[PDB]
Structures are given as C-alpha cells and as structure tokens.
Enzyme design. Structure first.
Site, PDB file in Angstrom:
ATOM      1  N   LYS A   1       2.844  -8.795  -2.415  1.00 28.85           N
ATOM      2  CA  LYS A   1       1.598  -8.967  -3.174  1.00 28.85           C
ATOM      3  C   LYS A   1       1.188  -7.679  -3.891  1.00 28.85           C
ATOM      4  O   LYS A   1       1.047  -6.629  -3.263  1.00 28.85           O
ATOM      5  CB  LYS A   1       0.458  -9.441  -2.237  1.00 28.85           C
ATOM      6  CG  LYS A   1      -0.850  -9.802  -2.928  1.00 28.85           C
ATOM      7  CD  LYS A   1      -2.090  -9.787  -2.003  1.00 28.85           C
ATOM      8  CE  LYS A   1      -3.425  -9.554  -2.838  1.00 28.85           C
ATOM      9  NZ  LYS A   1      -4.345  -8.404  -2.408  1.00 28.85           N
TER      10      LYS A   1
ATOM     11  N   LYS B   1      -2.169   1.201  -2.866  1.00 29.80           N
ATOM     12  CA  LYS B   1      -2.495   0.535  -4.123  1.00 29.80           C
ATOM     13  C   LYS B   1      -2.360   1.461  -5.326  1.00 29.80           C
ATOM     14  O   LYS B   1      -2.292   0.982  -6.463  1.00 29.80           O
ATOM     15  CB  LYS B   1      -3.930   0.010  -4.059  1.00 29.80           C
ATOM     16  CG  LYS B   1      -4.448  -0.247  -2.635  1.00 29.80           C
ATOM     17  CD  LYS B   1      -5.753  -1.034  -2.632  1.00 29.80           C
ATOM     18  CE  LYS B   1      -6.816  -0.328  -3.448  1.00 29.80           C
ATOM     19  NZ  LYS B   1      -8.139  -1.010  -3.338  1.00 29.80           N
TER      20      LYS B   1
ATOM     21  N   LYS C   1       0.857  -1.170   0.000  1.00 30.57           N
ATOM     22  CA  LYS C   1       0.000   0.000   0.000  1.00 30.57           C
ATOM     23  C   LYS C   1       0.898   1.226   0.000  1.00 30.57           C
ATOM     24  O   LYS C   1       2.013   1.176   0.529  1.00 30.57           O
ATOM     25  CB  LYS C   1      -0.931   0.021   1.223  1.00 30.57           C
ATOM     26  CG  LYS C   1      -1.592  -1.325   1.532  1.00 30.57           C
ATOM     27  CD  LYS C   1      -2.956  -1.455   0.856  1.00 30.57           C
ATOM     28  CE  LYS C   1      -3.580  -2.831   1.096  1.00 30.57           C
ATOM     29  NZ  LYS C   1      -3.364  -3.305   2.494  1.00 30.57           N
TER      30      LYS C   1
ATOM     31  N   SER D   1      -6.262 -12.697   5.000  1.00 29.47           N
ATOM     32  CA  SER D   1      -5.864 -11.296   4.902  1.00 29.47           C
ATOM     33  C   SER D   1      -6.956 -10.409   5.469  1.00 29.47           C
ATOM     34  O   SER D   1      -8.053 -10.866   5.792  1.00 29.47           O
ATOM     35  CB  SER D   1      -5.571 -10.884   3.456  1.00 29.47           C
ATOM     36  OG  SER D   1      -6.448 -11.548   2.571  1.00 29.47           O
TER      37      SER D   1
ATOM     38  N   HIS E   1      -6.734 -14.293  -6.357  1.00 26.03           N
ATOM     39  CA  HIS E   1      -7.489 -13.308  -5.597  1.00 26.03           C
ATOM     40  C   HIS E   1      -8.968 -13.457  -5.917  1.00 26.03           C
ATOM     41  O   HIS E   1      -9.340 -13.666  -7.077  1.00 26.03           O
ATOM     42  CB  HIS E   1      -7.024 -11.880  -5.908  1.00 26.03           C
ATOM     43  CG  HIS E   1      -7.483 -10.870  -4.906  1.00 26.03           C
ATOM     44  ND1 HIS E   1      -8.795 -10.459  -4.812  1.00 26.03           N
ATOM     45  CD2 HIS E   1      -6.805 -10.175  -3.961  1.00 26.03           C
ATOM     46  CE1 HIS E   1      -8.911  -9.568  -3.844  1.00 26.03           C
ATOM     47  NE2 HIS E   1      -7.717  -9.370  -3.317  1.00 26.03           N
TER      48      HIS E   1
END
EC number: 4.1.1.39
Lengths: 106, 455, 156, 453, 450, 104
Positions: free
Chosen positions: D183, D159, D157, D352, D276
C-alpha cells in the site's frame, strides 16, 4: 459416475477409434464419389494446429482408384513415421475441403 | 386503387424487388382491387392524388401488382405478387427495404389478414449489401474445421451465474468436444454478471479448453446492447482479448445495429453468430405477419456468419440461407428464384430440446454446413458438461462416418449409435439418459451458365 | 412447469417488472400450468433442470406467475400476470427487457395464441433509462409554442 | 418562520424519498419543531421567505420536510429530526449533488448549537442510478483467486524519503513473504524524492517478482490521487499499461467528483480500486457537529470503491452497511433507516492502524472473511525482515481461520491457537515475542416466496 | 514523540510550509509531547523506527514542532507551530499539501480537540500552483467594470423551476442593473431543469439583458458534476454558447476537480466563481476542524476568480485579495503570507442582505467585492428588475458618498434617503425591509530589498 | 534467521499439511454453512490457472463428510501428480466460501 479423461484431439473422427484400412477406404471413395480431390498432408505432432501442413506431393485430381490413394498414404507415413498424416478432399466448387481427418496421430 | 396499381401485363424487370403477399380480403372486396391496394399502400400510400405527384414521373415511382394466384387449399385467401423498381430504395439498406415493404400496409383495414411470404432481392441490389462478414467457407478455414457439422452448447441457467462460474460451465463443455458455447439471447450485461467480467472469464475458459484439446474453440459473446456505442465497445473488447466469435440478437437489437455490427466484424475478422429472438412474434401466425424466410434473407444481406434456423418450408429457407442460387419451389414456400451470386452463405443453427437421439435426423436434414447447438442435452448428462459434450461429439462423428459409408443413418439410427457406445462409455450412459440437392442444383446451374451463358 | 413457476401467494414487489399476457391455451392444458409455462419460457426457459442451476439461487432468478384472470367476453382465453425481479435485466436497456419478455415465449407450441398486453415498468427501473431527449414542456419552450396543438404536414 | 411549511408530522415518506437523520442541539430559545423545520428548509429550499418566483412552482412538492422528532437517549440538549426529500430534488447518479444538497448550507445555521448528520436513507430507485463498486467483493475475489480468508496488506513506511527503487524493495520483501497486498500511504502521490511514474515501474517489478516466487496473485495499491483529473487518470492508465491489478485513491481529499470518475474508469478497465478515508476524522469525530462516518461509508459505496478502510456497536454497523445487500434499522448500532442496496455489490472492509499478530484472533472474529487486514509496523517491524513479518502474519491469520472453521472460539482461545501455530513457524514464534449476512440472506429468501407481503 | 519531533531551536526556512495547530490536550499531557505528536502524525505517521527508516535521511523528512504559545483564554489549549520541508509535498497540488496536513492527525486520540488555524505557504510553493484563472484585475478589464463593488443575485427557489422560467428570473434581474446572477450550489442537472436547457435560456436571458442595458452581464452557470468528464463537458458548453462565467462547488465537488476546472478556465478565458458549500461542516467548531482562512488559501492556490467569504473575517479577506498579508494575531493571522504576483480573488458577500446593509457592506468589503442579494432582490414588491435597480442605486450612492469623504456607515440612513428622492424603486425598497500594507511593503522592497 | 522462499497455494498453505482429521473439519465447516463441496485438480505447473479440471461434479445437498473425503482420495489416485483442491460453493454470494489445496 466415471471421470472424463482429457487428451489432445485432431478434429473430425478423432473422437472415434483409429481407422483400419477398411474404414479409411470407405472415406476415400466417399470423397471420390462426391467429386472431391483427395490430398495428403503431414506435420510434426507439436505443430498439428498449423494452418499449413507439409503437402505430400500434389492433390490427386481426377483420381478414381481408392488403392492408389491408400498407397500414397502408406508412402507418406513411411517417409515421415513420426509425423501425423492427414487425408483431405478438395471441393473446387465451394473452395473448401469436403472432408479432412487425421489418418495417423504420430 | 385498381386503375393505377393493378398492371396484369407488366412483366417484372430483373432489377425489380418482388414481393409475395398472402391477402385474406374482407368479404366485399375483389382480388384485383385488393392487390392494387397492397401495392399502393406499400409504396406510394396515396389516399388523394395531389399536385406534387404531377411534379414526378408517377408511372415509374410506384409498386405494382402484376399477378394474382389462389392459395392451394384456401379459397378465402390469395397470393398477390408485386414489383418495386430498384430506385424506390436506398442501396445497401435492408432497413429501408424492410420499412418500405412492411412499414404501412399491415394496418390496412380493408384486409382481414396480410402475410408477407417471400421477397425477391435482385442481384443488382444484393451487390449493394455487405453480406455475411465471412460466410461458411471462410469461417471453416479460419477455424480449421472440415467434414462434419459443428457442435455448440448454450449455457444455462440464463440467470444467476457469476462470470467465473459461467466460465466454468463453458470450460467443461469446450474441453469435452464441442466447438462452441453460447451466451443466451437474454445475456447482455445484467447485475449478477457484468459483461466485461463475463468476456474475460469466457476467454480464459476458451483458451484453457483449446490448449487441452488442440482444436480451435469459440464462444458467442453476446454484444446485444442498449446503444450502438455499447454494442461496438463490447465487440471491440472481444477482439482485444482474442475472442474469435461474437453474438447479436438482430431482431430485438434491430437491423441498423446488426448491419453496422456485420460491417465491423468483416473489418475486424470476428465471426458473427446471429440469434433470431422475437421472430415468433412476427412469423408464427400463418395469416398475419412476416414469414421467417423473408427474415432469413434480410439477415443474409444485413450480415451474419451463423443464423438460428430452428418442414418443407424449413428446408427451403436453409437453402435460401446457405446456397448460391435457389430455384422457385411452391412446395417449399419459395415463390421466386433467388440469386445470391458470390455473396457467401451462412451456417444454419439447430437448437431447442435436442439430445443424442436426434443426431441421425439432424446430420441427415441439415448436412455438414450447420451448427448443432445442445442446450440441456449437453449439461443434463449425469457425468457433467465434459462427458455430455463428448457423448454428443461421438454421436455426431459416428453418424457422419455412417453416412460417408452410404448407410441410411436415419433409418439405421439406433444401430449406428449403439455400435458407437461400445467405445464411448459417455455416449452409452447418455443413450439410457434420454428416451427414443439444394447444393447440387446451385452447382448444376452455375456450370450451365458457365458454358452457355444465357441458357 | 407449474410446481416451480406458479406462485399464487407471491405479492409483486415494487421493484418488480410485471407483465400481462393474454394466453389462448391449447384444448388440453389447465390455466395454472400454462401461466407457469409462460413465466418459465420468458425468464429461465428450462426444459431440464441441470447441475449448473444448483450453483445459483433458483428461487430469486426466475419469472413467476402470481395471478390469473378471465378475459371478459372470451372463455377461451385468460390473462396471466407475471413478476420478474429487477435484477433479471440490464439497467437502461429496453433492448434487454424486450428481448427477455418476448424473445422466446411466443413460439411456445403448447399455446394457441399469446398476446403481451401490458408491462409494468417500476420507478426504480424507469430511473435507469434516458427517457425523452426533451419532452413536451421543454420542447414547447424551445419552440416558443403554447396554448394549441401543433400542426404538421407529411410531404407526398 | 419555518415551522408551518417544513414541519409535517403527518407525512409518511415515500419509498423513493431520500431520508436523513440529523442530531440537532438547538439553542436555548428554540423549540424542537422549529429547529427540525429550519434544518429541513436550509438543506432543500434554503429559505423561509416566499418571493413571487416561488409561486411559479409547486412549493408543496419541491421541499424537504421534517416528519418526525425523537429524543436522544441520554442527552436532553439534543434530539433527532427525520427529514424526507423527494427523489426529484437531486441529480441522478451524483453523490456530489445529494451531498451538497444535504450538508452544503445547513451546518452554518446560527439558531442551532450543533448539527450532526447521523444517517442517510438512499432509496433503491436512486441507488440504481449510481455506478457503485467497480467490482465488489465477490468479483474481486474471482479476479484475484482468493477464497476462505481475509486478505492481508502492509503499508510501506517511511511514508517519506524513499526512492522509487528502494520503495519497491520493501514492497518485494513484503509480498514474497505471503502478504496479498502492499500500500502507498495516503500522502504518497508524486513528491520530489519518488516521482509517481518511477514508483509505479519498480512497485510493479516487485509485484511480478514476488508473484513469480510465490504462485499467488499479488498487488499494491498504487496511489493516483493527483492535483487534477488529468493527472489522476494519466496515473491510472499507466498502472493499467504496466499490468498492476489495483490502484488507490483518497476519495475525500481528492474529492467526490474525481472519485466517482475514477471508479467509472476502473470498472471500464478492470482495475480494482482501494479507497482511503483520509481527512474523515476532521468531519466525523466530534459527536455533536459534523457528518457521521457511516454516512461517509454509504457515499463511498455509491461513488465506487472495491475496498474501504472502516477502522464498538456503530463500527460493525457501518461494516454491514458497506458489505451487505440489505441492512435493517438498528439504533443499538446507529442505523436509523433500513438500507436496501439491491444488487449493488459490497465493498471490502479494511482494518488498519497499529495492529500486530496478537490482534489477529479479534480481527478475524469481528470482520470475518470479507475484509482486508492492513499491517503497518506489524510487518515492517519484524526482527528478521519484511519477508518474515509478512510470513508471521500470514501464518497467524491462517491459523485463526483454520481454528475458526473448526468451531473454536478464536478470541477466548487466542493465546493457545497462536502458540500451537508458533511451533511450526519460527517467524510467527519470534513475532509473538516482539509484540449480519444471515439477515440479508434471510430477507432475500422470504421476499423470494412471499414478495411484498 | 518529543525526542525526535520537538525541535525548539529550529528556525523555519523560507521554503518550509508552516502549520499552526490549536491543540486541546487531555489533562495529563505535556504541551511539548502533544506538539511533537502532531508534527509526527501529520508528517511521518509514527513515533517508532523500523529498518526501512534507516534507508532514508530521517533528519530531513519530518515535520518539526518548533514553538508553542498560549491561547488568550482556553488555558486547556495551546498553539503548536510546525514546519514541513517543501520536499514532503508534490508541487502544484493543494490536494497533496491538504491531505498531508489534515489527512491523519485529526483522529489523534491524545488530544481532546485539534484545530488547524493557519498555514504558511512559502513563495517557492505558491509559484508552483496555477492560482486564480484571471483574478480581480483581469476580470475587471474583461467585464469593463471599475469603481464599485459588483452586484449579484442568487436565483430562488433553488428547486422546481423550468429552464425557461429560470431564465425569466435571470433576465429580469440582469436588466434591472445587477452585474451577475448565480445558479445555486445545489443546482446541477436535476429532472425539473436539465443543465443543457438551463445553460441555453440563461445565456438567452444574459444577452437580452445585456443588449437592453449596454453593460456586460454574467451568470454563474454551475458545472459541479458527478464526474470530471461531466464537469468539463458543462464548462465547455458554457464557452461554446458565449457565457463569460461559470461556477464550481470546490469543497463538495472537490479539490482535484476544482484545480482542474481552474486551469481549464484560464486556458479558455472563462471566469470562475467559487462556492464554499459545506465549509461549515469543517470550519465552525472552534475546537476541532480546519479554519476557513486555511480553506481560503487552499482556494486561491487551487484557483478561483470569486469566493464567498461570509475581525477574523477581514483577515481572510486580505489573504484572499492582497499581494502580501503581514502576521496579525488580532485577526487570527499567524504568519506572514506572501503571494508574490499571484492575482487576488474577488470577495463575495451573501446571505440575507438587503438595501439597509449596503452602506456597511461597501464600507467593510471595499470596491473589489461581489455583493449577492438573494431575496433582497427578488423580494422587492415591484418585481426583479425594480429590486435590482433599488440595490444598484443604493450601492452607487453609498460609493459616491464614500468617495465624497463621508462616514457611510454612520450617515447611512441619510445617504440612502437622499438618493431615494431620485429613485422610486429604492425608496419603496427601504420601506419593505490591507491594500496599503501590501503596497507599502512593495515600495520598501523595491528601494533597498532586505 | 533467513527466510526460505518456496511456492505456495493460497488459503492454509502457510500451515502444516492437513491429515485426515483436519481436512474433514474444513469439509464439515463448509457443509455447516450450507455450501456445496467441490473437488478440482490440475498439473502442478498450472496451479495458477483459473480453471482446474473438475473432479466429477459439485456435491449438492451433501451432508456426508466421509463421502467427500473419499472422493478426494479417489481423485488423488486418478491424478497422483496433480494438485487436488477442495472448494465450497456459496450459492447466495455466487462465490466460494472456502478453497484450499488438499494435496500439493
């Protein structure tokens, strides 16, 4: 149980104790008795997996006297005391080596 | 059948393919007519002569029985010798030669049993086939290995092992002194070990043991596959990752696939280990089927660098596999001279329930240009795969050093092995563990033809 | 061979590949032990149990003889029925199934003769193979041929 | 009307049949047998009508048919219809076709107030037609060389707004701190501020630099979600070209066709595939109308992935569905059929979403070893940097695992374990200041000795 | 949330994407914290701030809740209007815009229900998308069909038909007067009918019926597939054999796959019929999900030449078909949508319609539509060809009436009965069962711009 | 406080080095799961190798924790410069239930 100690090897006969003059002699007359041509090679240790070792002089074509080959081994080792020394025997019928082994592991 | 297909005065041409069929005839048929039938059924298979035959040269385009012999010690069976003109076949196709010889006639009801014993491949047909991708001498040079038979292990269990655990067994074996480890013939790409993962971990094992020993290592990655595209994909990945040797099951995968794979191996420098799975279905029954020496010849032409060879007949087909010329020798089941010319020979592979105590008889029967593959005889060592491999490797060398010294290594077996254990604790423990000219003829003839030619 | 590969109480699963071998045993061997040998030789082929086996689940990854029958009109031969878990094989590979079943065991010296009579391909394995490229009904539609057997000639 | 053809309470499903369980909330006038029957017809042979073309076919074989009805515990308005479909109704190896067939028409049926697909029974004979995970848990562990603990990840982050190289810097710091993975977010594709090829180069650079400095295999889920299959594959190939071990895909928003193809490509190329579940809450949140996530779980396993985000009772239900080899029926956890996977491998469960050091004991205690634990702010938000947050989490994960292995009750004894580890770890100590398989193994043993019995 | 993400004075830019979310919050939530939370959860994912945020322009890279409105009715729901700078998204990627808007916010615990009503795609972003491979007008030129809605028949049963029997039903329909027949959504490549065999016989059916009617004929061969490679292979075979149109299940096969198929169709001159299989999972709950008009805009950007479209209804039909669609809350259209030159998509009507629906269907959908009769065609007592003729006669007489000035929906029964005096097939069949706004805007803009 | 980078060795290498009591517990936990303990070793520069040297063989059916702990110390003595790893083979999963470096 006993733990297997790992170490570098050097192909045929290297899993047996190094050869005295007597055992080397018998391999050489074996080769002469086969009609193969004795030959001598040497290379630095780190390069022993090379396809092409330094050739000591020339192959001993038509050689019958074991002792002359045994002396040429000594001379090669004396010229290159840090190098491994190999004995080979050429087989001109098969275009191969009938036999090859490291005489001194350097 | 007899009047057109029995030709006792025909002398085979040197371009002809020759076959030797052992025929066990039904009680009421004569030997002439049964030979002529086998010749017709394995070439023209004509049950009624029709007008289209008269458009062709019928005297040329036909197999022909030209000799009959007794089977020593069997009055019920006889040998039929048959010649086939080289034009009956597609060049460079064991597929076509095989299909032609054995595709129709073994169902001949008028015979009680039929066994194809030997096939004479004429030089002019040998030159149309690709042969071994490398052959014994090229391979020895590529792997930098001389003066001793090569040594391999076949990883067990065949089933249940993950790719990584399988590589672990491989690593332990190679690092202890074997040159080769091997995929079982059933190991292709099953759920518990996908082939791509197997190849990656085996190559990792191969490289690690090679770095730790300073001797070139290999592992026959089995590329036997459902389809040619899958077979070639697997072979390409082994080359991609650096693997020196792959494996094919040439009978069960089949000759078309095997021939193409051998072509690909030569074009890509990959050595090719050939497994003979299924052969006992074809070659065990002495009265009906195809003798293994035929299947040996088919494989040399089709292409392989090693071949599993598994008494007098056994020593015969090893010669057929390895040497440049093999003379007729009924005592070793060799019914025709076989000339291979410059077509290289193939490593013979000995496997199946052998351990250290077989080593003197193995070095003595097989000689140097052979691979000695230990299944449980390496893995079963009470100290692991590395110690088991070292024991086999010490026993192998000491038998070679004994023989080069002139000793009768098979007679003096228990003595050479005992002097060897005095330096290898690993060979000693293994000895308590388990209980208990072909070349020279070929050279003599090449030199003879070299000085005199036709003589 | 018998203690690990003869399982007379095992009932085949529907996912299993089944084989029927007609075994003609050598004079001095019992039928139990010969069935169990054919099962072992056509799946694990183990002649000495070693440490790598103990890394695997040995009860799953093995063929198993589960029934024996007489051959009607032949007291010298018997039928051995053998189950193989579907996981022993590569999907969509008659090559692998064939090689596995018949690649090793027909050379078993301890038997006088061996004949593979039938193989049960379970549906779950049939679905992994391609099958006929077309099949009878598609072909009939492609060739617009119905109501009679088709007719061919082989050129000579 | 549907009842006569599609309501068959006398039918017992073949073992090769696809079974479905719908929670049907009928309109006030319609009785249960007719609702179940309509659902079954509108999701197989989508009509009550008999036209002449139907008589050309075996109408009795080629239909879905409802075969059982059940009450919904504590909801009289709704009931369960169990429906069977012959394996022949579907293209093989195509979750796209089984999905379309099951859910592509029936959900607009006006004679029902609410329709919710609860579970789907995939028969072994159809599972063996699908590719499955490109590797699965045990193969991935071998390739990565990680055993005896859950895997650890962090999502970068913000994003939005980071250049390729700035992004790789947050990746490097995290990885060198002891996290196994970083990720791409779901929305990270190839936006003007960080073009995908540049992101892949710098992330991989960070991956190699952190791996060199730690001695542990590292990876970063590179997102190949793309406008077209051509772009998806190009991105995947480049990640392999540069040596990245793991890529990532948004299987629902990219689509089931692309994802099955990606999984195939991954298995053919040795690249792990992190999945995802973006958009899933559009579908699986409302408990009266949509598709339950456990169905979305099974479609992913069949389509192919090596990791799937999985997020009480139902949650560990679908985790077992995702990882285990065989899962028996259990209505206490929303599992309405036995699910047999055979040899198709299990997929890592990924946790998560707003988790930090303090959740570690419960996470290890619930997900176990074969899971990935993804930390958003729980790693970025550390007050000594990313490297220290990564280390703090790594230490607290390992302490929980050592504590678990030792017989402790890591949830009941959460505070003590983390404190005792805090003493040897300044990073974890300040971070503390800022914030199933038995069954599948039992059934395999029994089926080994007894078989069908 | 409200501090950063509620920006009531922000006036959106012409280049921003805008989203209109119908939020249903829990009782104790203020509407602006909910609107700011939905802006943040669909753009940045968080409310906090970690050190990596400060490496970036946080003021530019975020969605803004910039207005909140009441919902006529549900006093527990409000409309939240949100702006997203064009730079948050990859160009040419409905997948990335879609993921970004709906990939995360819909699980937000703080609302009882979230419903995406509409999305304003700015003309600067429309121009990066491939759009329809051909669109309404190019398709009419390729098929040589003007002046009427087109007619189609979905073949049934979806199940159990051989390729050749399937081709039979196609042939009998096409020769009857229908323009198109259609593979079902679930027809891909099943054991009873492998795709290659179906494609061959359908194409046979299509050419036989075309040569016997002198009208161009189509059949939507469904290439929805397990993988992109299989999808493309099937699309390639339809082209190799001459098929003019194919079909794809854009939501279940998926947006990445479909965007790729659309571009292949334009590269290859193959028309592309789109099925909205499973839309109802997503778009039916008025309190939680994504409204079908969002799904309709997604498809036009992604690429289709036809699209199944079932007040609201006529809103999303305009969105699908016209160059400019003005905001119209009475039709749930919350923003002006400009499409520029991006061609429009044929509206497809289906589901249980027969001859009696014809006057209304021509009235409601207009000429640029495809009207798909399942059992309405096959179920005719005299077979598929007779029922195709009945439907084609009814359609053509309803259109001649409309052109003649009549109220076709009120004079419906009269229009039909009169034309059935010339068509037995029709008479027995009876016994058995936006533009002007878009062009007004173009002319006005052509004269004085703004 | 600035973070100090050093080489690590997968599971448990972020915790303090294990004395004898802790090593035994991991061994006991692996046996309690029915896994086969194993012992491997390798030169430090080679710790990332997939294939370490096997110390002897895995200890199948082993219930004596104290005998595995002895063989660890036996292996350390034979290779004092090598890293020593304890592993636990899971036959059902065909994986390792546990793996950690006992001596660095």
């Amino acid at each position: 149980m006993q733990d297997y100690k790992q170490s570098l090897k050097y192909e045929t006969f290297s899993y047996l104790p190094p050869m005295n003059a007597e055992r080397i002699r018998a391999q050489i007359k074996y080769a002469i008795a086969q009609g193969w041509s004795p030959g001598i090679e040497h290379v630095e240790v780190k390069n022993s997996m090379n396809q092409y070792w330094y050739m000591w002089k020339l192959p001993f074509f038509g050689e019958q006297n074991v002792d002359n080959v045994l002396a040429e081994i000594e001379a090669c080792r004396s010229a290159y005391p840090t190098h491994q020394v190999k004995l080979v025997a050429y087989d001109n019928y098969a275009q191969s080596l009938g036999l090859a082994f490291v005489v001194y592991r350097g | 059948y007899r009047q057109t297909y029995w030709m006792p005065e025909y002398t085979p041409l040197d371009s002809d393919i020759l076959a030797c069929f052992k025929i066990t005839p039904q009680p009421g048929v004569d030997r002439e007519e049964a030979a002529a039938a086998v010749a017709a059924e394995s070439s023209t298979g004509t049950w009624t002569t029709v007008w289209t035959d008269l458009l062709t040269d019928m005297d040329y385009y036909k197999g022909r029985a030209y000799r009959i012999e007794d089977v020593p010690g069997d009055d019920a069976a006889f040998y039929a010798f048959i010649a086939y003109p080289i034009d009956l076949f597609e060049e460079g196709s064991v597929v076509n030669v095989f299909t032609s010889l054995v595709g129709n006639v073994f169902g001949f009801k008028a015979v009680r049993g039929l066994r194809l014993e030997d096939v004479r491949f004429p030089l002019a047909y040998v030159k149309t086939c690709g042969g071994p991708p490398h052959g014994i001498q090229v391979e020895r040079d590529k792997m930098n290995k001389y003066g001793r038979p090569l040594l391999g292990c076949t990883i067990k269990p065949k089933l249940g092992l993950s790719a990584k655990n399988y590589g672990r067994a491989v690593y332990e074996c190679l690092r202890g002194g074997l040159d080769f480890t091997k995929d079982d013939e059933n190991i292709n790409s099953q759920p518990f070990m996908r082939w791509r993962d197997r190849f990656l971990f085996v190559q990792d094992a191969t490289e690690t043991a090679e770095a730790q020993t300073g001797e070139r290592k290999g592992h026959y990655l089995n590329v036997t596959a459902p389809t040619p595209e899958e077979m070639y994909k697997r072979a390409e990945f082994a080359k991609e990752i650096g693997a020196p040797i792959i494996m094919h099951d040439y009978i069960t995968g089949g000759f078309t696939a095997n021939t193409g794979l051998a072509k690909w191996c030569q074009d890509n420098g990959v050595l090719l280990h050939i497994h003979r799975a299924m052969h006992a279905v074809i070659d065990r029954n002495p009265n009906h089927g195809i003798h293994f020496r035929v299947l040996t010849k088919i494989l040399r032409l089709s292409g392989g660098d090693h071949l599993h060879t598994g008494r007098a007949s056994t020593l015969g087909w090893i010669d057929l596999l390895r040497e440049s010329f093999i003379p007729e020798d009924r005592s070793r089941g060799i019914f025709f001279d076989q000339d291979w010319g410059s077509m290289p020979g193939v490593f013979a592979v000995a496997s199946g329930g052998i351990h250290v105590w077989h080593m003197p008889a193995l070095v003595n029967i097989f000689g140097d240009d052979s691979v000695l593959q230990f299944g449980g005889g390496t893995l079963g060592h009470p100290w692991g795969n590395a110690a088991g491999a070292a024991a086999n490797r010490v026993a192998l060398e000491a038998c070679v050093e004994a023989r080069n010294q002139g000793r009768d290594i098979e007679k003096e077996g228990k003595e050479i092995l005992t002097a060897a254990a005095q330096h290898s604790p690993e060979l000693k423990i293994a000895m308590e563990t388990w209980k208990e000219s072909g070349r020279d003829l070929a050279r003599a003839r090449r030199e003879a033809l070299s000085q005199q030619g036709k003589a």
